[PDB]
Amino acid sequence: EQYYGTGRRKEAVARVFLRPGNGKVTVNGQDFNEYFQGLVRAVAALEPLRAVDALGHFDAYITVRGGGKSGQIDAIKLGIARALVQYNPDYRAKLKPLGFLTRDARVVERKKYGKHKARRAPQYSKR
Amino acid sequence: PRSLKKGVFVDDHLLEKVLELNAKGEKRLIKTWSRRSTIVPEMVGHTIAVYNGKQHVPVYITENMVGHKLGEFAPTRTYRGHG
Amino acid sequence: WKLEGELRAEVAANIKRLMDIGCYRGLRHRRGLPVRGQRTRTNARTRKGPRKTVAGKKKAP
Amino acid sequence: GNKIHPIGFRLGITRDWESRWYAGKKQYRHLLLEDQRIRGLLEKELYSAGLARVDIERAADNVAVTVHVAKPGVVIGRGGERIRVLREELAKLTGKNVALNVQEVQNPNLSAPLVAQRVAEQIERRFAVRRAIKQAVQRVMESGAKGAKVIVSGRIGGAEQARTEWAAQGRVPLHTLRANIDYGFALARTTYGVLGVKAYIFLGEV
Amino acid sequence: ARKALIEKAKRTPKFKVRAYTRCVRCGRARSVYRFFGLCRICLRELAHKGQLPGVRKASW
Amino acid sequence: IRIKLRGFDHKTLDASAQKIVEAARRSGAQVSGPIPLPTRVRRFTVIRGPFKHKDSREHFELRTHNRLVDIINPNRKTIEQLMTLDLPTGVEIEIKT
Amino acid sequence: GKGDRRTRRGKIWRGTYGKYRPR
Amino acid sequence: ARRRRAEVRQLQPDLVYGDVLVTAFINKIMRDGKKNLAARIFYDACKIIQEKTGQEPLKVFKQAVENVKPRMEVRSRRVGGANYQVPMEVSPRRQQSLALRWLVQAANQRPERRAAVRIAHELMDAAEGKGGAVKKKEDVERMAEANRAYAHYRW
RNA sequence: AAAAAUGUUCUAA
RNA sequence: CGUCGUCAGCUCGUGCCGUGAGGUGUUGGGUUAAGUCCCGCAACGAGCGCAACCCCCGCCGUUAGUUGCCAGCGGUUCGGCCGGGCACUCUAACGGGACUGCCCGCGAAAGCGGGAGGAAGGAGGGGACGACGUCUGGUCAGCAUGGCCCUUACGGCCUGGGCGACACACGUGCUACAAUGCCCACUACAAAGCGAUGCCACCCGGCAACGGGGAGCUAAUCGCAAAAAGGUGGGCCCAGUUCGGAUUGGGGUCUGCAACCCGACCCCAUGAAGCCGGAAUCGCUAGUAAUCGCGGAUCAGCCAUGCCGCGGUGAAUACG
Ligand SMILES: [Mg+2]
Ligand SMILES: [Mg+2]
Ligand SMILES: [Mg+2]
Ligand SMILES: [Mg+2]
Ligand SMILES: [Mg+2]
Ligand SMILES: [Mg+2]
Ligand SMILES: [Mg+2]
Ligand SMILES: [Mg+2]
Ligand SMILES: [Mg+2]
Ligand SMILES: [Mg+2]
Ligand SMILES: [Mg+2]
Ligand SMILES: [Mg+2]
Ligand SMILES: [Mg+2]
Ligand SMILES: [Mg+2]
Ligand SMILES: [Mg+2]
Ligand SMILES: [Mg+2]
Ligand SMILES: [Mg+2]
Ligand SMILES: [Mg+2]
Ligand SMILES: [Mg+2]
Ligand SMILES: [Mg+2]
Ligand SMILES: [Mg+2]
Ligand SMILES: [Mg+2]
Ligand SMILES: [Mg+2]
Ligand SMILES: [Mg+2]
Ligand SMILES: [Mg+2]
Ligand SMILES: [Mg+2]
Ligand SMILES: [Mg+2]
Ligand SMILES: [Mg+2]
Ligand SMILES: [Mg+2]
Ligand SMILES: [Mg+2]
Ligand SMILES: [Mg+2]
Ligand SMILES: [Mg+2]
Ligand SMILES: [Mg+2]
Ligand SMILES: [Mg+2]
Ligand SMILES: [Mg+2]
Ligand SMILES: [Mg+2]
Ligand SMILES: [Mg+2]
Ligand SMILES: [Mg+2]
Ligand SMILES: [Mg+2]
Ligand SMILES: [Mg+2]
Ligand SMILES: [Mg+2]
Ligand SMILES: [Mg+2]
Ligand SMILES: [Zn+2]
């Protein structure tokens, strides 16, 4: 009666709950499209069940805290895919090759002393 | 400026000089190191010798300089320009 | 409120009184330098105006 | 000059702190200054004993200075009277309950701080500096250590042109963290000036 | 003008404003950390010595 | 019957935690296992050199690890025994109702 | 403009508050 | 690069048209990371081209891009001590990228106020072989035709 | 198959 | 401590060659980010370096469940709030995990190319780590220290002044020249840190800095807290402007014994230069650059647009 996937991306954690239903999505009690309103990277967070024709097959009850709105998006993308194999493991092919089962570890590189950001350097002026 | 919750600032010792001079039928030369003291209406007519760090510059105080500190009339930097 | 021409009278006469009494800001407004504690080694270009470039010290050969 | 201090580099892997205790923000320094004031006192008093490492523990109103010394007998004095002349003068500075303990060191020539002081004392008695280095490194290898390096910087033999001298036997991997490397420095001070004595004893990887 | 200044720094001032911190170990008046009573140099020396309880070279 | 332990060394903080929750696990009832509260890290970034060399530092940090231990029922057979326990040096204990 | 203390943007840049960045 | 080539970064197809070409384009509109702003600009322009001359805009967009791809461009070489204008053909990758670059670039030249109008109107002109990004592409191809004498210096 | 001149005195530790 | 230079190097013991300096080894074939490995060889080993061990980040586990968390039943002033629970998220310690281990191909080998599994693959990303030495590099002003020098003074206290000067010149930056923008209002999503004459919830005063009240918090509990770009809605309409916020007049706020020289801030007014910058020149190869905000050290206050960190959004291109 319930299927779960954990989505992590860039300090943004996601607890997505795949439950059967007409298709509706919720995020932190707010509806999806009320939460990522006018954020065109919206539908990428649901693309998992576009490679597995379950768009309207599940409702989803999602939670995200930390990171940022797009950081949560790829975390929702990862959990929705994570829950689908947790629903059935036959789904793994058509999900793993499409990069859905992997978690991109691209995090902000730490600032380093003598520099202005991770690698941006103070302007060189010989004399 | 000095927060007017607190008063207007005289070092108290320089004030003693002002009013000791008032009650005596002033004036007299008033040397001071209190550039940080406000000009106060009891000073008009006096000539207060202000120390710029080097010399004690005299300053005759008129009614139209009461809002200011005494160091505004003894400048600390000799300049003359470049040439 | 007092405006256009009149306002500028009370601005001018105030600066005037600053220069008249010998206030340090009056010395500042005389020589046309900053009055609010800014440094003048570099910049102050608004208050001083276009750079009157001069020759400099010479290195040895 | 470009080399990390081998102890600071290892603290938490090979090396435990000389002073270990907890203290909140409001009196970390007070406990630190009292320790610095204690260690100096003993590093002045127990210098004639061959003091190698002062351990200072702290809990509540009582400080437990476990001092490590080559010759413990010259510290304790007569059956515990010099140890008592200090267990008191320590408490006179501690104000607390000063627990002063003495510890036997296995082989002093396996103690980098000691050897560093010996070479420092030797070139204070105007010895051959180069020879004093080869002498030292040798005593350490004999004493079983897996490697030793001894460095002297300064006006070696009073020469106006200052200079570094060193020797090393066995391995001394300074970049290896599992390598137990006792570091010790002693400062030689002579008529012509001041000289630096760095001792690196490889005890063996763990 | 060091020792008299390591001394005067201690002595309680005429005004709390003149209160400035000063290293306990070397007497440096700049880059002095409240937490240790030391300066940034002495901080590095005592640390490397292991005489600074609980502080290690950070990396991340 | 709450007890919170602090210290810089986390190795001793953990052995000084389990030595407590193993104690009150002698005279029951239950204890609430040692939760690790978040570490409070105090950094220090100082110039590596004593002079002028600004763009080269060395990072240090002071780690103040945190553990909480709760013994659910009082039972004075440990509210006497815990006082007879051996907690290492760099461990500070706070015990609350 | 961050340099404009007279707007919400300038008060954010100096991290101060006022009629132009009310808290 | 010195050791090996650069591996061309593959982009995620955009969520409206499913096109990597749209994505690279929106990335060329983007400044300071404000992608969604650049997403709105490309998409609000996509509407306008579906209005003015009602056509499937993705087809118009790909006619602009196609009509801006430069097939040749001069490049400097060396032999002895020279720095010629060597006419060398353009790799299909650099073909696309110069288009996308000059597209946005010449579009931002245009005088209409808001961006999507500037983007839409250039893609309308460039899909018909007019406007800035064309006059640049054609001009580049012109200079290469000129220096066809230094073509024997092609590697 | 090569656009472009020069570097004060003693000391080289 | 900087530097060359995270560059792949620098050497030693013995043996061999050479009258000797010195040579060999350390060269040569291939390979690697690497003197990295392999093969060869009058060389055979060794050491300082390189890699590794260590720290953060990415996947899973184990042990943990309050101050953290709420999946599901119970209530519910509808706020995880109370029952209860630790599943999840998390917090934080200990583990596991990738080894070119597997396949195909090449190869003498080392490896290299590609494919599989996998969260991760070729050193996964980032840090810490800097060889022999070089620059008579830097620091006697952090400290130490030899010598030279001063001794009612070159020592010491104090008050004021100066380190903030300004015809000029350079370096590093902050803010801009605008519409992919500016402005008001509403509305979202961070991490890392700090906090007991400390952080200040909330309340009234004030246009506002702030003031006065006034809880909580020795802090996964109370607070700093608003994150901002963003989203939504409206205004401006190409103007030296609703761009820009310098300069200056006035009016205050606070810290402080004291803001004249010489503090920050707040309100009214003022509203400069600047329409994208000559010769020339800098940084960056990916969660980088670019942009956006946040915190800390020092600190009464603060001239911080600086420094060290933190996350948000997030590109372009590498033929060679
Ligand atoms: Mg984390
Ligand atoms: Mg960033
Ligand atoms: Mg000035
Ligand atoms: Mg001194
Ligand atoms: Mg002070
Ligand atoms: Mg200080
Ligand atoms: Mg710098
Ligand atoms: Mg801006
Ligand atoms: Mg020539
Ligand atoms: Mg000549
Ligand atoms: Mg030989
Ligand atoms: Mg021979
Ligand atoms: Mg030889
Ligand atoms: Mg060989
Ligand atoms: Mg050789
Ligand atoms: Mg070589
Ligand atoms: Mg060689
Ligand atoms: Mg050779
Ligand atoms: Mg390398
Ligand atoms: Mg290494
Ligand atoms: Mg559990
Ligand atoms: Mg020199
Ligand atoms: Mg000296
Ligand atoms: Mg000195
Ligand atoms: Mg200065
Ligand atoms: Mg200039
Ligand atoms: Mg700046
Ligand atoms: Mg500049
Ligand atoms: Mg602070
Ligand atoms: Mg704040
Ligand atoms: Mg104007
Ligand atoms: Mg103009
Ligand atoms: Mg305007
Ligand atoms: Mg404005
Ligand atoms: Mg004013
Ligand atoms: Mg001032
Ligand atoms: Mg314009
Ligand atoms: Mg430009
Ligand atoms: Mg690189
Ligand atoms: Mg401050
Ligand atoms: Mg200023
Ligand atoms: Mg700041
Ligand atoms: Zn110091």
PDB file of C-alpha atoms in Angstrom, chain D residues 14-119:
ATOM      1  CA  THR D  14      50.149   8.639  16.396  1.00  0.00           C
ATOM      2  CA  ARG D  15      50.446  11.353  19.018  1.00  0.00           C
ATOM      3  CA  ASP D  16      48.324  12.179  22.049  1.00  0.00           C
ATOM      4  CA  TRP D  17      48.191  15.708  23.437  1.00  0.00           C
ATOM      5  CA  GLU D  18      50.688  16.807  26.065  1.00  0.00           C
ATOM      6  CA  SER D  19      47.789  18.491  27.896  1.00  0.00           C
ATOM      7  CA  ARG D  20      44.497  16.583  27.820  1.00  0.00           C
ATOM      8  CA  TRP D  21      41.274  17.727  29.526  1.00  0.00           C
ATOM      9  CA  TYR D  22      38.017  19.484  28.709  1.00  0.00           C
ATOM     10  CA  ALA D  23      37.129  23.082  29.548  1.00  0.00           C
ATOM     11  CA  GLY D  24      34.406  25.340  28.244  1.00  0.00           C
ATOM     12  CA  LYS D  25      35.097  28.569  26.445  1.00  0.00           C
ATOM     13  CA  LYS D  26      35.144  30.631  29.644  1.00  0.00           C
ATOM     14  CA  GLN D  27      38.268  29.072  31.145  1.00  0.00           C
ATOM     15  CA  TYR D  28      40.101  27.075  28.464  1.00  0.00           C
ATOM     16  CA  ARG D  29      42.779  29.777  28.454  1.00  0.00           C
ATOM     17  CA  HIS D  30      43.054  29.983  32.250  1.00  0.00           C
ATOM     18  CA  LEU D  31      43.758  26.268  32.323  1.00  0.00           C
ATOM     19  CA  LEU D  32      46.094  26.720  29.345  1.00  0.00           C
ATOM     20  CA  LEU D  33      48.083  29.547  30.950  1.00  0.00           C
ATOM     21  CA  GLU D  34      48.416  27.631  34.215  1.00  0.00           C
ATOM     22  CA  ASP D  35      49.719  24.640  32.226  1.00  0.00           C
ATOM     23  CA  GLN D  36      52.148  26.830  30.277  1.00  0.00           C
ATOM     24  CA  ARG D  37      53.143  28.319  33.622  1.00  0.00           C
ATOM     25  CA  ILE D  38      53.535  24.800  35.040  1.00  0.00           C
ATOM     26  CA  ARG D  39      55.449  23.254  32.135  1.00  0.00           C
ATOM     27  CA  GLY D  40      57.918  26.121  31.984  1.00  0.00           C
ATOM     28  CA  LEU D  41      58.532  25.782  35.721  1.00  0.00           C
ATOM     29  CA  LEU D  42      59.274  22.065  35.408  1.00  0.00           C
ATOM     30  CA  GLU D  43      61.041  22.434  32.042  1.00  0.00           C
ATOM     31  CA  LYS D  44      63.291  24.802  34.012  1.00  0.00           C
ATOM     32  CA  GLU D  45      63.437  22.696  37.180  1.00  0.00           C
ATOM     33  CA  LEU D  46      63.618  19.179  35.717  1.00  0.00           C
ATOM     34  CA  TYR D  47      65.971  20.153  32.880  1.00  0.00           C
ATOM     35  CA  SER D  48      68.850  18.675  34.896  1.00  0.00           C
ATOM     36  CA  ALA D  49      66.819  15.432  35.094  1.00  0.00           C
ATOM     37  CA  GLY D  50      66.340  14.859  31.364  1.00  0.00           C
ATOM     38  CA  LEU D  51      62.683  15.825  31.119  1.00  0.00           C
ATOM     39  CA  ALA D  52      61.152  14.530  27.888  1.00  0.00           C
ATOM     40  CA  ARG D  53      57.363  15.019  28.006  1.00  0.00           C
ATOM     41  CA  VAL D  54      55.161  16.749  30.589  1.00  0.00           C
ATOM     42  CA  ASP D  55      51.670  15.232  30.726  1.00  0.00           C
ATOM     43  CA  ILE D  56      49.067  17.454  32.397  1.00  0.00           C
ATOM     44  CA  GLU D  57      45.611  16.119  33.242  1.00  0.00           C
ATOM     45  CA  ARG D  58      42.776  18.149  34.723  1.00  0.00           C
ATOM     46  CA  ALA D  59      39.367  17.348  36.187  1.00  0.00           C
ATOM     47  CA  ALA D  60      38.091  19.505  39.048  1.00  0.00           C
ATOM     48  CA  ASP D  61      40.314  21.506  41.448  1.00  0.00           C
ATOM     49  CA  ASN D  62      43.176  18.976  41.140  1.00  0.00           C
ATOM     50  CA  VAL D  63      45.804  18.830  38.384  1.00  0.00           C
ATOM     51  CA  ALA D  64      47.733  15.616  37.644  1.00  0.00           C
ATOM     52  CA  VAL D  65      51.149  16.493  36.189  1.00  0.00           C
ATOM     53  CA  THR D  66      52.560  13.149  35.021  1.00  0.00           C
ATOM     54  CA  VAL D  67      56.148  14.139  34.165  1.00  0.00           C
ATOM     55  CA  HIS D  68      58.268  11.853  31.939  1.00  0.00           C
ATOM     56  CA  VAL D  69      61.984  11.905  32.750  1.00  0.00           C
ATOM     57  CA  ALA D  70      65.082   9.917  31.819  1.00  0.00           C
ATOM     58  CA  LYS D  71      66.553  10.007  35.344  1.00  0.00           C
ATOM     59  CA  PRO D  72      63.599   9.970  37.777  1.00  0.00           C
ATOM     60  CA  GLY D  73      65.793   9.727  40.872  1.00  0.00           C
ATOM     61  CA  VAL D  74      67.099  13.281  40.512  1.00  0.00           C
ATOM     62  CA  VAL D  75      63.487  14.474  40.357  1.00  0.00           C
ATOM     63  CA  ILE D  76      62.145  12.691  43.463  1.00  0.00           C
ATOM     64  CA  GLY D  77      65.198  13.782  45.465  1.00  0.00           C
ATOM     65  CA  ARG D  78      65.628  12.179  48.892  1.00  0.00           C
ATOM     66  CA  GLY D  79      62.841   9.604  49.264  1.00  0.00           C
ATOM     67  CA  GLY D  80      60.375  12.164  47.946  1.00  0.00           C
ATOM     68  CA  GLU D  81      61.604  15.481  49.389  1.00  0.00           C
ATOM     69  CA  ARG D  82      62.590  17.280  46.192  1.00  0.00           C
ATOM     70  CA  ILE D  83      59.443  15.715  44.725  1.00  0.00           C
ATOM     71  CA  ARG D  84      57.768  17.305  47.752  1.00  0.00           C
ATOM     72  CA  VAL D  85      59.564  20.659  47.434  1.00  0.00           C
ATOM     73  CA  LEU D  86      57.939  20.763  43.975  1.00  0.00           C
ATOM     74  CA  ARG D  87      54.640  18.999  44.799  1.00  0.00           C
ATOM     75  CA  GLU D  88      54.212  22.116  47.008  1.00  0.00           C
ATOM     76  CA  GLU D  89      55.655  24.910  44.828  1.00  0.00           C
ATOM     77  CA  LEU D  90      53.567  23.430  42.015  1.00  0.00           C
ATOM     78  CA  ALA D  91      50.549  23.673  44.333  1.00  0.00           C
ATOM     79  CA  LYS D  92      51.670  27.196  45.265  1.00  0.00           C
ATOM     80  CA  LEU D  93      51.217  28.008  41.561  1.00  0.00           C
ATOM     81  CA  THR D  94      48.321  25.558  41.085  1.00  0.00           C
ATOM     82  CA  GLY D  95      46.234  26.698  44.041  1.00  0.00           C
ATOM     83  CA  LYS D  96      44.756  23.286  43.330  1.00  0.00           C
ATOM     84  CA  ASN D  97      45.653  19.744  44.419  1.00  0.00           C
ATOM     85  CA  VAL D  98      48.821  19.173  42.393  1.00  0.00           C
ATOM     86  CA  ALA D  99      49.333  15.457  41.686  1.00  0.00           C
ATOM     87  CA  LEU D 100      52.950  15.181  40.516  1.00  0.00           C
ATOM     88  CA  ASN D 101      53.904  11.780  39.083  1.00  0.00           C
ATOM     89  CA  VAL D 102      57.201  10.546  37.641  1.00  0.00           C
ATOM     90  CA  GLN D 103      57.464   8.079  34.764  1.00  0.00           C
ATOM     91  CA  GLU D 104      60.315   5.801  33.721  1.00  0.00           C
ATOM     92  CA  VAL D 105      61.302   6.247  30.062  1.00  0.00           C
ATOM     93  CA  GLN D 106      62.298   2.992  28.356  1.00  0.00           C
ATOM     94  CA  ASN D 107      65.395   3.910  26.346  1.00  0.00           C
ATOM     95  CA  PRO D 108      66.363   7.613  26.523  1.00  0.00           C
ATOM     96  CA  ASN D 109      68.091   7.301  23.148  1.00  0.00           C
ATOM     97  CA  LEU D 110      64.645   6.340  21.822  1.00  0.00           C
ATOM     98  CA  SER D 111      63.419   9.731  23.103  1.00  0.00           C
ATOM     99  CA  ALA D 112      63.883  12.353  20.380  1.00  0.00           C
ATOM    100  CA  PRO D 113      63.441  15.274  22.830  1.00  0.00           C
ATOM    101  CA  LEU D 114      66.267  13.896  24.975  1.00  0.00           C
ATOM    102  CA  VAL D 115      68.785  13.248  22.181  1.00  0.00           C
ATOM    103  CA  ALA D 116      68.023  16.731  20.866  1.00  0.00           C
ATOM    104  CA  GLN D 117      69.034  18.165  24.239  1.00  0.00           C
ATOM    105  CA  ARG D 118      72.174  16.024  24.412  1.00  0.00           C
ATOM    106  CA  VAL D 119      73.431  17.233  21.027  1.00  0.00           C
TER     107      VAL D 119
END
